Each structure stands twice: as structure tokens, then as C-alpha cells.
Design a protein around this ligand. Structure first.
Ligand SMILES: [Zn+2]
Length: 258
């Protein structure tokens, strides 16, 4: 027995094993566009992914991660509300069983078909493990996905999903350029939050892009064919692996645009 997204081990149950689930800076949250404050002091985001080195893709049971080599400053995020350099370590998604749900963050209560998370850690802390124990340890770039036209740069990812259908499976995944997953504009909203899966540590500085990217129905359909279960176990489709919006509490959401 362990956490998951089912009726008996879902988000509503996590607080029992991870008390911080009821914390003061939990994520995701609903972004109220009319209450978010424009902050002129916010610097533009600086994304340097030209030297990114992807290594592998694996199904860990709650989603699939594309891992990158983070032994050097190859793919980094700087600027915006960030102080220092943050290295990209992995990216993953959160999707639904239907196109009307799947994203973790919501905009004026609107849900998107999926949400992409690019996770980076503050180099000042030496490694990811130490970074998660700090309030400014991680920076996660959130991108919404809506169903429409196909996204060319995403196809490489969808075509290998068949090789990592079940929990525990991994496959070599080299030379993937994450730049093909970014929208045209880099305008964003930002707020202090947490990881959206256990251990739910409150070490994240969220950067949610205003502009979603479009993916085709066929592309998202392939995501839905993945399994939560391991090989040789009853098939349980990997869908709705998203956590519901949490109370904003004592926090303010800032916007880089007005
Ligand atoms: Zn995530």
C-alpha cells in the first residue's frame, strides 16, 4: 500500500502519510487572473536549453520522467523571480481521462487537458537532494496543454511511450531538445509553492506560463495508454494523475505582464 491517485490512496488520503499536505504553501492553486498583481520589478525569464543532454525516460508509476544530465550547467533557467542558477533535472506531465481535465493549476477555474512540469534545482545547494530541503531550492516551469493542432516537438516523446508502458520500465532517450515544448511567449505568473506529489515539500518557486501549447487528440491519447501498474499486474490506466487545487492561504500570485 502507498500513495497514488485512486479512490483509496488518492490526494485526499496523502495527508496521513505526509502531514505537510495540509501545509501553508501547498500546490497547485487556482490562478485568479484578476487578483494576481502585476509586478514591474519582475525580470524576464532566461531559458538556456541549447546544451541540454537528455538521458533516459522512465515510468515510475505516477507519471513518466524525461531525465537530463545535471552534472553541469548545460540546461539552465535564470532570471524572472529567481536569484541564482537552476539546472534542469527532469520534466513530466499531468493529464486526465478526458480533454476537460488534467492540469494541476487552473486559470480562473479553467482546467486544461494536461500540464507539463520542467523541474530545476538551485545550483547553490550542490544536488537535487539538498535543494528540496530549502525554501528556494527548486524552480518548476509549468506549461498548460490544450487539445488542437499537433505539437511537432512532442512526437519523439509519444512514440517511445510503448516501450515504458508499465511501472519500472525505462529506455534510453538521448538528444531530445526540450525547446520544442515551449510556447511563443514567456509571460508568466509566479508564487511560492510545493511539489504536487509526495513528499510535497514546500521548496518550489512556481513559474506558470500564460500561453498554453497545443497538442493533438492523438498525441494525448497515447499518454492515456500508459499503466500505473507494473508488468504482470492487473491493468490500471495511467489517467487523472493530477492533484486538485489547494488553498492559496497567506500568498500572493504575481504576474510578469499587465
Ligand atoms: Zn508535476
Amino acid at each position: 500500500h502507498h500513495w497514488g491517485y485512486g479512490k483509496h490512496n488518492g490526494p485526499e488520503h496523502w495527508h496521513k502519510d505526509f502531514p505537510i499536505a495540509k501545509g501553508e504553501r501547498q500546490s497547485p492553486v487556482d490562478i485568479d487572473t484578476h487578483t494576481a498583481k502585476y509586478d514591474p520589478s519582475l525580470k524576464p525569464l532566461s531559458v538556456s536549453y541549447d546544451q541540454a543532454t537528455s538521458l533516459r525516460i522512465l515510468n515510475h508509476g505516477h507519471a513518466f520522467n524525461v531525465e537530463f544530465d545535471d552534472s553541469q550547467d548545460k540546461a539552465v533557467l535564470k532570471g524572472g523571480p529567481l536569484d541564482g542558477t537552476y539546472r534542469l533535472i527532469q520534466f513530466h506531465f499531468h493529464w486526465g481521462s478526458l480533454d476537460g481535465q488534467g492540469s494541476e493549476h487552473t486559470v480562473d477555474k479553467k482546467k486544461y487537458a494536461a500540464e507539463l512540469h520542467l523541474v530545476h534545482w538551485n545550483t547553490k545547494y550542490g544536488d537535487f537532494g539538498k535543494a528540496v530541503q530549502q525554501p528556494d531550492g527548486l524552480a518548476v516551469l509549468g506549461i498548460f496543454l490544450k487539445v488542437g493542432s499537433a505539437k511537432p516537438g512532442l512526437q519523439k516523446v509519444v512514440d517511445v511511450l510503448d516501450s515504458i508502458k508499465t511501472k519500472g520500465k525505462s529506455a534510453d532517450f538521448t538528444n531530445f531538445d526540450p525547446r520544442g515544448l515551449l510556447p511563443e511567449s514567456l509571460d508568466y505568473w509566479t508564487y511560492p509553492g510545493s511539489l504536487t506529489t509526495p513528499p510535497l515539500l514546500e521548496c518550489v518557486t512556481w513559474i506558470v506560463l500564460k500561453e498554453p501549447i497545443s497538442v493533438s487528440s492523438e498525441q494525448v491519447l497515447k499518454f492515456r495508454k500508459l499503466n500505473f501498474n507494473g508488468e504482470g499486474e492487473p491493468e490500471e490506466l495511467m489517467v487523472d494523475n493530477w492533484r486538485p487545487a489547494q488553498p492559496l492561504k497567506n500568498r500572493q500570485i504575481k504576474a510578469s505582464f499587465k
